Amino acid sequence: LGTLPAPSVTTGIVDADIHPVPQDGALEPYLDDRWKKHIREYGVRTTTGLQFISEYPQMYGGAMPGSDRELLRTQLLDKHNIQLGVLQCLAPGLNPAGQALNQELAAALCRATNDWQLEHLVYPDPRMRAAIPVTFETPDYAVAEIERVGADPGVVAVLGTSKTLEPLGSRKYWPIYEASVAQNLPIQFHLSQGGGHANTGTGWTSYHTEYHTGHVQSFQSQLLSLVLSGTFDRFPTLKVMFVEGNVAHFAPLIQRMDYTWETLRGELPDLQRKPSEYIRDHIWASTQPIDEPEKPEHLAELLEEFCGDNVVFATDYPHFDFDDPETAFPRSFPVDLRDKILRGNGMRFFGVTN
Amino acid sequence: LGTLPAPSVTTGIVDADIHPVPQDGALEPYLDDRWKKHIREYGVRTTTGLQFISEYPQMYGGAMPGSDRELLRTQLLDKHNIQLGVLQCLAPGLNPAGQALNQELAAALCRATNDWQLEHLVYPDPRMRAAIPVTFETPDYAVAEIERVGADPGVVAVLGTSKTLEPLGSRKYWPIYEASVAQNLPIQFHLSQGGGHANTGTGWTSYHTEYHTGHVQSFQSQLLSLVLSGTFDRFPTLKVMFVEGNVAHFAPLIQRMDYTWETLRGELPDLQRKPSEYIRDHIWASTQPIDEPEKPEHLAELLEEFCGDNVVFATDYPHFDFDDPETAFPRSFPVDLRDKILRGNGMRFFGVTN
Amino acid sequence: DGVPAVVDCDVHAVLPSPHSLIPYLDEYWADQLVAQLAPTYEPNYHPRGSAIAQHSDASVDENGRAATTAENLVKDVFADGFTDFAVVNCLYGVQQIHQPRREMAHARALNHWIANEWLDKDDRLRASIVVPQGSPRAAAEEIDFWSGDKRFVQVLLLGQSELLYGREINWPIWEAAEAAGLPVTLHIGGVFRQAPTSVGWPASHLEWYVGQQSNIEAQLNSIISEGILQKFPKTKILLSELGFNWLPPFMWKFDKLWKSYRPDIPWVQESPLELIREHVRVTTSPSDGAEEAGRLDSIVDRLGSDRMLVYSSDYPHKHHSGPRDIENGTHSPELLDRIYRRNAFDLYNLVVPS
Amino acid sequence: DGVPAVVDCDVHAVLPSPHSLIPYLDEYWADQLVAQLAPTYEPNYHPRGSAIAQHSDASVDENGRAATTAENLVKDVFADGFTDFAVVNCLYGVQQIHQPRREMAHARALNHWIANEWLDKDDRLRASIVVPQGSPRAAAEEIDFWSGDKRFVQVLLLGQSELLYGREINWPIWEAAEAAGLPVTLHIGGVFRQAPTSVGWPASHLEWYVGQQSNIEAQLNSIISEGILQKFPKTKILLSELGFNWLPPFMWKFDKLWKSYRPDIPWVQESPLELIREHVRVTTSPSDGAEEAGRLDSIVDRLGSDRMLVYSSDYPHKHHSGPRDIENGTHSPELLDRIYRRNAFDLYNLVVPS
Ligand SMILES: [Fe+3]
Ligand SMILES: [Fe+3]
Ligand SMILES: [Fe+3]
Ligand SMILES: [Fe+3]
Ligand SMILES: [Zn+2]
Ligand SMILES: [Zn+2]
């Protein structure tokens, strides 16, 4: 690695969610041989009884400088004037690194991935920056990794998963937030599987409609926890973003939260503010996959009802449901709202100076 | 509190599990009014949807100085020459204090209980000592409580529950072990409910036979975790005892463990010893409810097969299935084994000098 | 013909004590109950001391409790003459009895208590059939059993179940409800046999209560995706005390993913948008902010149907907003007439008596 | 009459790939599978690279894998002439397909692959019926379907299920097995729809593998307590690759608690001690230390019956001890004759052919 400038966004856009198309032995020069042998013998054991796949496969997933950079440069970065593209590598290669039941292996794989995306994508083309995967279920290792590479300017955020063993407001994770706030880093939680419980609070889903729609639910529960535990009283500078868990649903969820709090606030007397008052400074959300109301004017209504300043654009390239910054919004969409979704809102979240 | 001597056991016996029959307002002089009001409004929320009871009631539970001391003195301590009676108060009053989903409440209730059993039972009759309940699911609070009262000579152990959110070998609990080893305290894990998962690894039990027999299973899983995580490599002085999770089953479980390890040890290369080799210095177990083989000579066989030095007597007074130090063993039982179950084995576990 | 009546679609009878079921139990279960020390399955859905438990204005019994007698309930619910009928839901926690035969017996006893002590005492009262959710075939027999008593107007289920209600093992309930001509309602509350969220246990009653909307999204997706509405085309679903403002973003996403995945659930040939609009109804208390100026008009608009909301007071629970405050959120007398009379007529067929 | 044959009660066919099921699928499911990028449900019960996966001595295919063809399996299993029949279990993870109709279709295809590619190729082979565990009524139909082919000799279930196998929703399997005259086996492996232990997720394959004996205690208690043996009195159960040395302490405790709780399960009038001895059989590989001097005699003695153990090699898995090393643990030729021939005759009725 040489040296990098802080990210810059002027007339291009922010893209919060990009999944770098990796390569096979790519991680092997960053893994010690202990874990090479261990992976050769056991794979990456997770919250399944499956040797290779996750509990909910995709049902059609697959298509198509050097490695994979030129395609990313020309298909995505050049094509869409992306000045800040945040890389979110959850699979070595499709289960999250941090979710490996062997947590020492998981931290080795997290380490290998961070060294790899930095050297191979960010530093060669610093329009891309990394959200570094860490082992959220072993805070000690995650703190160590945030300290190892978090201060590098190639790193713009800490990367977690929507599904966890305890809700993200639980004290188990406060050391990770404390380390993040020390590195001046925000945290992104990506839609994921696993985590240790069923994919809903009331059983496992059957068909692909329940599975993929169900992903918003984990996010609904993580917002409630993070807010009503007082996590944002303890860490008043912490910014978190929910990624690929759509946006519009958060608005009626927060609306219900305040409504119930008006009656039951006595249960949580240390909570310093009204619950919806924490959204502005602490909770962002990315757009992909965009919400598609029957009447398209409802989209801008609900995004503003969540918070118009805290919604950030993402492509989710190269997934099948990827969003295009042109096509994704309806044509009556307010121009000022769209512009700050593309530029300003992400700029504030990631800390890039105007 | 005045001052106390270290416990002394000469010709009497050790009783590892005694449940002090508490009183209603007893904890109120040790609870701040915040939690008084909070308990008045919400009870003690736990891993159920039940306002008062636990998910598996007893189906016949109930019977019958000052408060409750004289009955304990004369019915139990005097009657059985008990020189070291370890108090294990899991209910304020029957769900464990530490298991309260409001963990701040749970630490307040743990605090209130520790101050109460110390002042009300131990110091008035120091034949009784306390195993102090802590909040195992919030290590920070549990460390704080081990440091607040753990050095008091009225305290002989740290008290936990058989059911936990993660297996006890998980790093989540290592700060608690580190604090315990610093206070020169062993840890007792009592049979419990709750913990956050079903009462077996494959669903919830239906009838009372499955429920009460099923309690050994949680212990089987906690032994495997505690040993195969290398927890006893990291804390080579740590002693833990499984309480009211019978004894005999541990022997074939450990036997299977070594057998499987002979083939799959490669998965865990940092593990310093053969798995059964950790039993001697780290794993004890209490006797109640005594195992009752069809051929009574199998009892001594299996206790020795677990480890003859690590089995400790307990009455579980005043529960219905309580054991009598006379009646509990069969008459062919080897006299030397019985004597150290009554005296020496517990003496070593609790650190009372010969 | 005739004018559809104003039906209060959700009010509660509070069982004074488990003792109240003894008259309706067989001698076997009566002995079990008396021998068990009569453990109460009073739920924690509305903690008896919390602000949501009861109104300050409510009629109470000698122990300060609201809604434990029909006399107290009728005196409050009907006092102003606006309501013609109230649908009674008793949420006593028989669904949390783990012993399957005891769950059967207490559920039948609870229904007997409702018939004789509530429905018999006032002909303006109706009720739902509490069912033993743990054994669907037995729940179907409990529905058949009461199908002959037209005062029982719907089938009661909890928002959180053991397996999602679309799973085939749950079809006997849907079939039996359809053959009895009864809507199935889902009321907030759960069996608590997994963590109430896909990311673990919520730490406060407040957090649990707001978040239960997530489980209802999972249930509606399970019910529709698995084919319940094609298999049982006359099924009606009522969501009781579960909010409604979360519905539109859920419906939009579900419809988006149904189009992307139609071959995976070929039995689903109508749009989930339309199925939900035609088959799902929702009570109005709590209103969760829909009572503010224009917000009722906005939500109906986003819902895409004025036939979904049915009036309820949720007596005797206290909410930030009162049973008739929804009028401040609409300017359309026609909409208010559908919420008070016309929509509930689709569920119960109750015309104003004389 | 005739001499009962030496039956190897547990050997494995390894599905080479999900592609191998395409010939047996309907065009609907074949398209789904081809479109899905053919995700493989190869389990992690025996990680393909781990030491337990296969013997060094084993016949392999062009990819180094053992037991993917009948030709390789027959060549090893029967090479020395000692075995007359082998019962084939394919553990390909169709039970972990969450889509219930796809689970049905792949289970039937797997059984078709077994019949045509294994049972057809050699008449010394038998198999179990893989069943769609997620829909018990469909699993009963899968049993009915193959009941006409006497080469299928037992019903395959995993040690870990979604709900315990005594629960009423699972009775269609017990009924169908009984009507087909087939024993039900439980083989190590799980659906992984809750944590594999009551205290959470085990961190290594080793820890998971040893601990699965705990789930089998929960299953045997569920099956007996709920009345399966009274309801289906001819039921036979085989425990496959699950150890046996844990049985006696479990049986003693279960019997103790049955006596203390007989009115709670009145259908259980025989002692669980006797029921287990009469209805449960257990394969001998792994032996878990029973192969050491005297240990086979000791365990039979503790078991209280010489009719429970049946011979198995567990081909092609590697265990610390070999299929016939159990002879070093007994001095009784009569016992060895029951383990090799007489006990399995209770399951399959296989006499030595000519
Ligand atoms: Fe993404
Ligand atoms: Fe994506
Ligand atoms: Fe006890
Ligand atoms: Fe006890
Ligand atoms: Zn209600
Ligand atoms: Zn096997």
Our CA-based measurement puts residue D67 at a distance from the nearest CA of chain C, in whole angstroms, of: 33
> Computed over its alpha carbons, how large is the radius of gyration of chain B?
19
- Distance between CA atoms of residues A329 and A226, nearest Å: 29
Å from CA of C208 to ligand 5 middle: 15
Our CA-based measurement puts residue D187 at a distance from the nearest CA of chain B, in whole angstroms, of: 14
Q: Is B244 annotated as a binding residue?
A: yes
- Distance between CA atoms of residues A275 and C57, nearest Å: 28
CA-based max dimension of chain A: 59
Q: CB distance from A59 to chain D under 8 Å?
A: yes
Q: Tell me the β-bridge partners of D282.
A: D239, D309
Q: Which of B137, B215, B131, B142 is nearest to B176 (CA)?
A: B142
- Distance between CA atoms of residues D156 and C209, nearest Å: 41
Task: Assign A179 to helix, strand or coil.
Answer: helix
- Distance between CA atoms of residues C42 and C20, nearest Å: 12
Chain D residue closest in CA terms to B60? D261
Contact B166 A165 (CB under 8 A): yes
Q: CB distance from B335 to chain C under 8 Å?
A: no
Q: Report which residue type is found at C120.
A: D
* Burial degree of A175 (CB within 10 A; 0-12, 13-18, 19+): middle
Å from CA of B144 to ligand 3 middle: 25
**DSSP labels, B46-99:** -SSSBSSS-SS--SS------SSHHHIIIIIIHHHTEEEEEE---------GGG
Chain D window 256-285: which residues touch B at a Cβ cutoff of 8 Å?
256-258, 260-261, 264-265, 268, 272-273
Q: List Cβ neighbours of A151 (8 Å cut-off, separation of 6 or more).
A: A183
Å from CA of D194 to ligand 3 middle: 28
Are the C-beta atoms of residues D186 and D237 closer than 8 Å to each other? yes
* Burial degree of B157 (CB within 10 A; 0-12, 13-18, 19+): buried
Are the C-beta atoms of residues A344 and A181 closer than 8 Å to each other? no
Q: Which of A172, A159, A281, A164 is nearest to A229 (CA)?
A: A172
Task: Assign D266 to helix, strand or coil.
Answer: coil
- Distance between CA atoms of residues B222 and A181, nearest Å: 35
- Distance between CA atoms of residues C59 and C315, nearest Å: 11
Are the C-beta atoms of residues C100 and B206 closer than 8 Å to each other? yes
Chain B window 166-225: which residues touch C at a Cβ cutoff of 8 Å?
196, 198, 204-208, 211
Query: H-type helices in D81-130, by residue range?
Result: 100-114
- Distance between CA atoms of residues B214 and A80, nearest Å: 60
Q: Which of D308, D202, C345 is nearest to B169 (CA)?
A: D202
Beta carbons within 10 angstroms of residue D186's beta carbon = 26
- Distance between CA atoms of residues C221 and A209, nearest Å: 7
Q: Is B334 annotated as a binding residue?
A: no
Q: Which of C311, C304, C271, C159 is nearest to C220 (CA)?
A: C159
Tell me which ligand sits closest to the C-alpha of residue C11. 5
Å from CA of B17 to ligand 4 middle: 8
Closest Cβ opposite residue D320 in set B209, B259, B268: B259
Beta carbons within 10 angstroms of residue B65's beta carbon = 12
Beta carbons within 10 angstroms of residue C334's beta carbon = 9
Are the C-beta atoms of residues C227 and C268 closer than 8 Å to each other? yes
Q: Output the CA torsion sign for A174, A178, A179, A183.
A: positive
Total length of chain B: 354
Q: Which of A178, A200, A195 is nearest to A187 (CA)?
A: A178
Tokens 């050994």 sit on residue: B216
Contact D96 A40 (CB under 8 A): no
Alpha carbon C138 to its chain centroid, in Å, reads 20
Tell me which ligand sits closest to the C-alpha of residue A286. 1
Phi, psi of C215 (to 5 degrees): -65, -30
Q: List Cβ neighbours of C270 (8 Å cut-off, separation of 6 or more).
A: none
Our CA-based measurement puts residue B283 at a distance from the nearest CA of chain A, in whole angstroms, of: 24
Token duo for residue D168: 């009423």
Å from CA of C128 to ligand 5 middle: 12
* Burial degree of A326 (CB within 10 A; 0-12, 13-18, 19+): exposed
Q: Which of C241, C315, C314, C283 is nearest to C72 (CA)?
A: C315
Q: Which of B196, B21, B151 is nearest to B93 (CA)?
A: B21
Closest Cβ opposite residue B225 in set D202, D319, D321: D202
Q: Which of B282, B2, B16, B23 is nearest to B129 (CA)?
A: B16
Chain B residue closest in CA terms to A197? B197
Are the C-beta atoms of residues B128 and B322 closer than 8 Å to each other? no
**DSSP labels, C202-229:** -SSHHHHHHHHHHHHHHHHHHHHHTTHH
Token duo for residue B349: 């576990």
- Measure the CA angle with vertex D292, ends D287 and D295; round to 5°: 80
Residue ranges and CATH numbers for the domains of chain D are 7-351 (3.20.20.140)
Å from CA of B195 to ligand 1 middle: 33
Instruction: Report DSSP state, residue C196.
Output: S
- How far is residue B154 from each of residues A281, B88, B124, measured CA to CA in Å? 49, 13, 10
CATH classification code of A13-354? 3.20.20.140
Q: CB distance from B303 to chain D under 8 Å?
A: no
How many alpha carbons fall within 13 Å on the CB side of residue D137? 9
Chain B window 240-269: which residues touch A at a Cβ cutoff of 8 Å?
266-267, 269
Contact B102 C204 (CB under 8 A): yes
Beta carbons within 10 angstroms of residue D141's beta carbon = 16
Phi, psi of B185 (to 5 degrees): -120, 135
Instruction: Report DSSP state, residue C163.
Output: S
Token duo for residue A315: 């492509």
- Distance between CA atoms of residues A146 and A140, nearest Å: 10
- Distance between CA atoms of residues B250 and B220, nearest Å: 7
Number of helices (H), then strands (E), in chain B:
14, 8
Beta carbons within 10 angstroms of residue A184's beta carbon = 10
**Residues of chain C positioned with their CB less than 8 A from the CB of A220:** 211, 213-214
Q: List Cβ neighbours of A82 (8 Å cut-off, separation of 6 or more).
A: A12, A13, A14, A15, A76, A127
Which residue positions of C form the known binding site for Zn(2+)? 10, 12, 187, 241, 314
**Residues of chain C positioned with their CB less than 8 A from the CB of D264:** 32, 99
Number of helices (H), then strands (E), in chain C:
12, 8
Contact D252 B222 (CB under 8 A): no
Q: CB distance from C199 to chain B under 8 Å?
A: no
- Distance between CA atoms of residues D311 and C112, nearest Å: 55
Token duo for residue A195: 């985590």
Tokens 């005296």 sit on residue: B343
Token duo for residue A117: 């995306």
Token duo for residue B155: 């305290």
The contact set of C with D (CB < 8 A) is 32, 99-100, 134-138, 162-163, 167-169, 194, 226, 263-264
Q: Which of C40, C26, C193, C39 is nearest to C101 (CA)?
A: C26
First-last CA distance in chain A:
26
Contact A171 B138 (CB under 8 A): yes
Beta carbons within 10 angstroms of residue B174's beta carbon = 17
Are the C-beta atoms of residues B172 and A196 closer than 8 Å to each other? no
Chain A residue closest in CA terms to D33? A59
- Distance between CA atoms of residues B125 and B136, nearest Å: 28
Q: Tell me the β-bridge partners of D186.
A: D157, D239
Resolution in angstrom units: 2.5
Q: CB distance from C193 to chain B under 8 Å?
A: yes
- Distance between CA atoms of residues B299 and B293, nearest Å: 6
Token duo for residue D127: 């198999």
- Distance between CA atoms of residues B248 and B241, nearest Å: 14
Q: CB distance from B52 to chain C under 8 Å?
A: yes
* Burial degree of D174 (CB within 10 A; 0-12, 13-18, 19+): buried
Q: List Cβ neighbours of D73 (8 Å cut-off, separation of 6 or more).
A: D11, D13, D59, D67, D86, D88, D118, D315, D316
Tokens 């307590």 sit on residue: D225
Are the C-beta atoms of residues D186 and D154 closer than 8 Å to each other? no
Beta carbons within 10 angstroms of residue D83's beta carbon = 20
Which secondary-structure segment (H or E) carries D8? strand D7-12
Å from CA of A19 to ligand 2 middle: 8
Are the C-beta atoms of residues C226 and D100 closer than 8 Å to each other? yes
- Distance between CA atoms of residues A214 and C218, nearest Å: 6
- Distance between CA atoms of residues D161 and D165, nearest Å: 7
Are the C-beta atoms of residues D262 and D224 closer than 8 Å to each other? no
Chain B residue closest in CA terms to A140? B171
Chain B residue closest in CA terms to C32? B59
Contact C215 A228 (CB under 8 A): no
Chain D residue closest in CA terms to A208? D99
Task: Assign A167 to helix, strand or coil.
Answer: coil
Are the C-beta atoms of residues B96 and B194 closer than 8 Å to each other? yes
Could you tell me how many CB contacts below 8 A there are between chain C and chain D?
A: 29
Total length of chain C: 354
Q: Output the CA torsion sign for B178, B179, B182, B184.
A: negative
Token duo for residue D15: 């599905």
Q: CB distance from A33 to chain B under 8 Å?
A: no
> Computed over its alpha carbons, how large is the radius of gyration of chain A?
19
- Distance between CA atoms of residues D112 and D21, nearest Å: 9
Tokens 């081909």 sit on residue: D315
Beta carbons within 10 angstroms of residue C65's beta carbon = 17
Chain D residue closest in CA terms to B219? D199
**Residues of chain B positioned with their CB less than 8 A from the CB of A138:** 171
- Distance between CA atoms of residues D232 and C259, nearest Å: 46
Total length of chain D: 354
Provide the experimental method for this PDB entry: X-ray
Closest Cβ opposite residue A200 in set C198, C204, C265: C198
Token duo for residue C175: 């079939």
- Distance between CA atoms of residues A6 and A8, nearest Å: 7
Q: Which of C102, C169, C222 to mutate to test the interface with D (most CBs of D within 10 A)?
A: C169
* Burial degree of A108 (CB within 10 A; 0-12, 13-18, 19+): buried
How many alpha carbons fall within 13 Å on the CB side of residue D200? 28
Closest Cβ opposite residue C99 in set B40, B52, B207: B207
- D7-12 and A187-190 strand pairing: unpaired
Q: Is A316 annotated as a binding residue?
A: yes
Token duo for residue A260: 């119930």
Break sites following residues in chain A (C–N > 2.5 A)? 64, 93
Q: Which of B39, B35, B56, B55 is nearest to B47 (CA)?
A: B55
> Computed over its alpha carbons, how large is the radius of gyration of chain D?
19
